[PDB]
């Protein structure tokens, strides 16, 4: 969505979606879809 461009909730949010993850690991896990679809 859009909370602050791409940096809303949680210290580890998706800079592509504006998601929110409490773990940097889970961030990368979601961002796996941002590699090559
Ligand atoms: Zn994302």
XYZ file of C-alpha atoms and ligand atoms in Angstrom:
38
model
C 0.000 0.000 0.000
C 1.234 3.458 0.948
C 1.983 4.584 4.491
C 5.072 6.666 3.958
C 5.861 6.055 0.320
C 7.318 2.634 0.968
C 8.370 2.905 4.599
C 5.457 2.865 6.982
C 5.057 0.275 9.725
C 7.718 -1.981 11.322
C 11.513 -1.416 11.176
C 11.647 -3.830 8.247
C 9.032 -2.844 5.700
C 8.998 -3.555 1.967
C 10.499 -0.602 0.048
C 8.525 -1.845 -2.951
C 5.059 -2.174 -1.417
C 5.192 -0.430 1.954
C 4.566 -3.686 3.814
C 5.685 -4.412 7.377
C 7.840 -7.147 8.877
C 9.250 -7.374 12.378
C 12.017 -9.571 10.981
C 14.405 -8.551 8.261
C 14.396 -12.201 7.209
C 10.666 -12.177 6.514
C 11.215 -8.985 4.517
C 13.620 -10.722 2.146
C 11.263 -13.716 1.998
C 8.468 -11.541 0.629
C 10.912 -9.601 -1.521
C 11.788 -12.887 -3.213
C 8.837 -12.082 -5.454
C 10.538 -8.804 -6.350
C 13.497 -10.562 -7.932
C 12.119 -11.903 -11.210
C 8.394 -12.169 -10.492
Zn 6.898 -5.944 -1.684
